[PDB]
Design a protein around this ligand. Structure first.
Ligand code: ZN
Ligand code: ZN
Ligand code: ZN
Ligand code: ZN
Ligand code: ZN
Ligand code: ZN
Ligand code: ZN
Lengths: 103, 102
């Protein structure tokens, strides 16, 4: 299982719009081959970034997704969010799951 | 749902020791009230930190956990086991789940 964490430093003033916009992105990724789960995570402290965490069957499944028309439409999101909404660029992290309490 | 992520900047030479030691104690949390799931995530770049991610029914369930005998007992069979194998300190980030495809 392959996981991405997209750290998005959205200002608290725009948190609701960000969430509303990202609800749509989760919709477009649902039918995606190898998609497992998406979570949007609000930070305890508003000065820290949101995390969009996405679970995939494999890195390859993620790569296919990045090249898809669904991904491009999903990005029509913070297309609508002004540049000013963010403190900085997003920071994308990626991982392989080494232990999972589930089965 | 409440999520913690503990970012562990283990050096690559000690990553195998970290993983295997965490495995030894990872089960201690399972019986805890409000525990949902735990994942240990290895970075794609060995220069980046591991993330230990845990899903909780509430923030108070997490907090109660950190007081438990099982937490103290487990943070000796991994919290002590590896030497100084780190680029710096752990960094705990906490979150509320606001969207879940599940
Ligand atoms: Zn490929
Ligand atoms: Zn390719
Ligand atoms: Zn490739
Ligand atoms: Zn490809
Ligand atoms: Zn391609
Ligand atoms: Zn993106
Ligand atoms: Zn711990």
């Amino acid at each position: 299982m392959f996981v991405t964490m997209n750290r998005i430093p959205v200002r608290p003033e725009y948190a609701e719009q960000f969430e509303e916009a990202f609800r749509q992105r989760a919709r477009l990724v649902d039918r995606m081959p190898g998609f497992i789960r998406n979570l949007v995570l609000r930070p305890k402290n508003p000065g820290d970034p949101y995390v969009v965490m996405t679970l995939w069957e494999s890195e390859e499944a993620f790569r296919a997704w990045t090249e898809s028309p669904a991904f491009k439409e999903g990005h029509a999101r913070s297309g609508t969010l002004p540049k000013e909404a963010f403190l900085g660029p997003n920071r994308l992290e990626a991982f392989e799951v080494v232990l999972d309490s589930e089965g």
